[PDB]
């Protein structure tokens, strides 16, 4: 109820200091380096992708600042501070819709977006007052996993989409004809039967004496007269990249084989435990390090994550921090209630589901946890980031899970080679702080990531997407389609529910994935969070479609390993 | 004594028909398909490499003809049908020196080599008459593993090394730095301040008015015209290749990863076992299938394997069948006894050590073998090859072993995935025949391998090298010196033979390996076989340096498999 959220803080304050001294060097150092690089790339790409859309009033710097701020407060005042936030599809689409709505009565974007951001923030406060942890517990595995797994796959989907997309901006000579190598050339030249736009572009910009200069230009230079890249070395607007496409694929493919090699070192027998694990958690940093040397030696001009080195608010119509919201006539502010209310619901439900996925019996919880405090800290930080007109980041699934696995407490007497002991997972509360502090300080740090190529981070991302789901029981079953039925291990959840019913839960769950997939692909697509509601309604039905016993074997709330221990000790 | 190799044939007669009907498709098909390709490129690089050496007296086709016969007869008429007689170092150097010796008193090269070939054939005939078999016992695991490990290590190195050479002969740019890509050029041009060498080459070949040609000649034409390549894309003699390095590396890595993935699919569990196992054997065939297709589609010119379709003598002044030697001074033929005596010794020991390495009991077969038959068919094949003026071939290590490992019976009764029972190996002896049958018929066909570039054959080569060294006990151990003794792998040495004693033995084995290694690298390298002699002498000394019980564990002529059975049935 109202004033019952105090109990969360009271129940985490004795533990608060005790969770700093928990932290160690040689593990956290590595986790911080890993998450620092990981977290930086989506913020910048998102900031840019969003920059074009909301017409140059938002850019890399605005996303960097809001992201620094958010990370610093979240890692301090969260009742589950192990979620490492990252943007999602509803925000990106929502902003575009806000933008399309903001093409009439469009006197300031910023004042309208602060009014919308404030209404949804304050509403998130109204939700934590009433009924934020009075319904949350009604959920079960079907829906939480349908949501988690589907999202995780998109993580992989855009890792690949990122690579294939590059393939469009970097083409190749499709048959080299080396004998004709010395004949290859490409020069810029004037349009032949030129379009009006090229025509208008040339006239109104006033370029004098272009003929002495048109015989050969640099790559940027031709793009500014809009001329044809004519030659036998031109098959697309972008010249024929010799090697970027095919090196990029080598970087991409080598990372996903090598990164998996490094994380499985933990169970190797060739060393004692002390030099083993410590090679197996520097992994992402070593893969960044070696692909960096290979790229340095044999110089392919492969893309990198670039960050600007100039510090400013963009468009000269922003202060660093700007309070005023007067320009829109007053009524629009009142009219914003219906979108901000749809958003407070999508934001609320995203957050809470993600909290449910952290607060399972996987990634064991040692101490108590709070829903209301978690929601409180996103709601206050959403309100202030919106008050400074900066980008929003919401608790993402795969990021939280990989953050939680990198730092971890493990036994002092490990079995010879085989049988590593999980023995919990760490919560420090200081690397989350430092990551977003050091990424805040990287407005003027441009050298460190510029070298770090884009492809190696893309592999890191896809590997991340794959390894989060090794603990999600559903994917295991998804991969059981071509597998025979006598070939699996004991898997108690298989022995007392028929094969026909196992496949039948996988087909239906897969149907709702396919259903999500098409709603995501609609030119609206914001129904998706609210779809988790329907996945609960339908779920209840299924007790009658199939026996209640028949779901107490799969969705069963306690994890499969424990029930294997339990049922074997009964017999 | 004499006529004592007859027992081998008497012991190979009973099995004769049963070892064709033993033969089964898809485990033999795939092996043939991978080998056909593998063996042709091996006898093609050695025939063209001898061609430059013998001023075009011996050709690759002469090499194809000798190879087709050498293999065809051997797989019919030997005592081990899984040995493949490959293009080996000793031949080349012998032929060099011989060519160098036939510059004083060397009117004819072909007749002199044929006389030596008949003499060394003859020397193996008196050797094979008496005691070919008895002296085999003096060779043991020490020497054979030392010898073998080095050969496989070298083979792996020249897979990688050959690839480096391709990048060296098709030069690459350190940095493209794309903006100036379009600015780059290189055109052929007349030599300025011409060197005496190109001055001379130009003059005597009589090619007038090259100035009108040298505005811009093609890469092939300029590179044999000794003209200077002048431009910004020529830092060196030839323009930088856009795509050859990265495409060759993609074929190389890809082939090395997919064949080893596929070959371990036996111990994966995605399908019923019967349809599982068939896929793994053809994987080499599958890597070939898909890479030929991919290169067919988007082409990157890279060197491709061609064979002379035209069936002829070389230089059109030498008869096919040639003639019996007679023109040379009679005495030179008698003088050839000493070089040929040297040759016989090395040929007998090189042959015999490879045959010992195949006829291990960890390499056991459900059939016999005959050393004396193998030398005998080698001796016939050595005389006929020499009388017809063709290249000789001595037993190569990796080819014979990758044959053996590629086809092996393995049980399908096993538990799914892990533990596929070893159940001996497979010696049908019908694939060797079928390989060499198809390259014999594929001497006037060239269309088959013109569409397979070298790099993919090189990735096959790297897979051959890595997978081959399975059976070598020593290399396993070298890789266990890092492993501690807390959870050390089960090697017999820990309780029966002290770590100190295993180490002293491995260090002395390694020193004699490094000594065989420097000997190989020596500008003679005739001395490589006689060293094997020394490896015995040194073996004897240790009979006073150590108890004999403590060395019967790793140099046993009964495998570990038997010791594991014995020592487990005692306790
Ligand atoms: C900055 C620069 O080098 N510009 C060159 C110019 O010097 C040259 O005259 C022209 C064609 O000759 O190509 C361009
Ligand atoms: C294409 C061909 O076969 N030869 C061309 C010729 O037509 C052209 O005039 C010359 C440029 O001067 O370059 C070369
Ligand atoms: Na999300």
Residue numbers in the entry:
A (entry chain B), B (entry chain A): 451 to 1021
Paste lines from the article.
NDCBE exchanges one Na+ and one CO32‾ ion for one Cl‾ ion4,5. SLC4 monomers consist of a large C-terminal transmembrane domain (TMD), involved in transport mediation, and a smaller N-terminal cytoplasmic domain (CD).
This region in our surface-rendered NDCBE atomic model presents as an extracellular-facing cavity where solvent can access from the extracellular side to the ion coordination area, suggesting an outward-facing state (OF). Na+ is coordinated by the hydroxyl oxygens of Thr804 and Thr847 and forms an ionic bond with the carboxyl group of Asp800, with coordination distances of around 2.4 Å, 2.6 Å and 2.6 Å, respectively. EL3 is stabilized by two intramolecular disulfide bonds, Cys636‒Cys684 and Cys638‒Cys672, as well as hydrogen bonds between the anti-parallel β-strand.
